Amino acid sequence: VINTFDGVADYLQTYHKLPDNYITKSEAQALGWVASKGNLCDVAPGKSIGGDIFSNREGKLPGKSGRTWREADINYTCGFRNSDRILYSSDWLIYKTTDHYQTFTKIR
C-alpha cells in the first residue's frame, strides 16, 4: 500500500487523487467498520481511512478563495487509528500532522 507521507504526497501530486488503498469514513462504515472496535482490517483488508473533507476548524492551514481541504490517515496498518494525517487542498497544497491536528508542516 501507499501510506507514507512522501508516498501519498508523491502520488497525490502525480495523479491528483488518493491511492487506491484509501476509503472514506462513510464508505468504511458501510463495509461494517465500527471505529471503536478498531476493526477496519477485518472488514476492509489493507485499507486506510482517507479522502474525507477536512474543515480546518482551528484555521491553521492557509485559506484561499475557492480552496477546500481533505485528509487521509498516514502510517495506518491495522487496529485503532493513529495520530498521523496528510492534508491536501483542492489546489494541491500538501501538509502533514503527526500530533493529531495540533500542528502542521508543509511538505508539497
Binding site: 469514513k25 471505529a35 477536512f54 476548524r57 482551528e58 487509528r81 495520530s83 493529531h100 491536528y101 495540533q102
Partner: peptide, 14 residues
C-alpha cells in the same frame, strides 16, 4: 490533540 479538528476526528472515527 485537544483541539477542534482532533475532536471532530474522534467523534467520527474513534
Amino acid at each position: 490533540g485537544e483541539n477542534l479538528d482532533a475532536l471532530w476526528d474522534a467523534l467520527t472515527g474513534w
